[PDB]
Ligand binder design. Structure first.
Ligand SMILES: NC[C@@H](O)c1ccc(O)c(O)c1
Ligand SMILES: [Br-]
Ligand SMILES: [Br-]
Ligand SMILES: [Br-]
Ligand SMILES: [Br-]
Length: 302
């Protein structure tokens, strides 16, 4: 599933923190440390599960094989030669290669990896887009071609496919009101969005749990959603290019369309700042998101 670009690593780090940070007194202290690649407190289940989360999402720990996988490191270095020195990347990969088979529980995985993390902190940090200076440089080089920090993922895709100043821009008026278009350009755009919020995997597969995650975040039950998605999947088209559009269309035209639009609107807001829930997990309120999304509507469709 690697190599990973800066946005992909940002998604992984922030999602893992969102799912693993304690609530209450220790949250802010923990966050401050984890952000700096200080995986402490080492004795905390939250730190241990955070560590496991990152390792699993990157592929550095394979819970099926119950083994660490150093090939992720070499793939990352191959994609980003500027982010490592060969000898040091090799030393890091070697340390991972020589880790023993490890059980798939947070404590076991964290304990096995922690010595490697400490012995190869800078090497791993640089390679996996944790170096602020190096990452800033990559974002600047990439510019409009990658989702930027503090930019809505929806905005990123919209600008890519319906650029400002172009004769295409006007289509955003309908698009942002959940009008399902039929053309190649819209299918490409919808692919960009659906993959960007992880409803569709890099591997072009539906991720029902990600859709469910967003429903739960707007306080909706997911039984109907699962039934809808099950029906949608039995109608999945052969053309891989069309898959994201297929599920978007199916959801928008379905018996859960209102809940879907509510969940998708909130996701848009949260996609604008990946650390949305990190300092404190924010309670959801429908009217506040209503306001924000309407403001974005008037920005993209003036
Ligand atoms: N809130 C934005 C939402 O209406 C939307 C849905 C689908 C899109 O392809 C899009 O750009 C925006
Ligand atoms: Br702490
Ligand atoms: Br590079
Ligand atoms: Br961000
Ligand atoms: Br933060």
């Amino acid at each position: 599933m690697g190599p990973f670009d800066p946005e992909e690593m940002l998604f992984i780090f922030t999602r893992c923190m969102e799912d693993n940070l304690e609530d209450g007194a220790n949250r802010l202290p923990m966050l401050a440390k984890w952000k700096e690649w200080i995986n402490e407190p080492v004795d905390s289940p939250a730190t241990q599960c955070f560590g496991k989360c990152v390792l699993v999402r990157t592929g550095l720990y394979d819970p099926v094989a119950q083994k660490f996988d150093a090939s992720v490191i070499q793939e990352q270095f191959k994609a980003y030669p500027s982010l490592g020195e060969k000898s040091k990347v090799e030393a890091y990969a070697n340390a991972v290669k020589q880790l023993p088979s490890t059980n798939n529980d947070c404590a076991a995985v964290f304990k096995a990896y922690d010595p490697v993390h400490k012995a190869h902190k800078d090497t791993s940090k640089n390679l996996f887009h944790g170096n602020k200076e190096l990452t800033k440089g990559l974002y600047e080089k990439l510019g409009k071609d990658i989702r930027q920090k503090k930019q809505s993922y929806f905005e990123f895709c919209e600008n890519k496919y319906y650029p400002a100043g172009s004769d295409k821009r006007q289509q955003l008026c309908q698009i942002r009101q959940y009008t399902v278009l039929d053309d190649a350009l819209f299918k490409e755009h919808t692919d960009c969005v659906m993959k960007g919020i992880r409803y569709i995997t890099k591997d072009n597969q539906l991720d029902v749990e990600e859709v469910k995650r967003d429903f739960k975040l707007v306080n909706k039950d997911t039984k109907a959603l699962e039934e809808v998605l099950n029906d949608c999947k039995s109608k999945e088209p052969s053309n891989a290019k069309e898959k994201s559009w297929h599920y978007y269309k199916c959801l928008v035209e379905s018996s859960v369309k209102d809940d879907f639009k509510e969940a998708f609107d909130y996701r848009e807001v949260r996609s604008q700042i990946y650390a949305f829930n990190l300092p404190k997990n924010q309670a959801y309120s429908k009217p506040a998101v209503q306001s924000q999304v309407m403001e974005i509507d008037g920005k993209q469709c003036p």
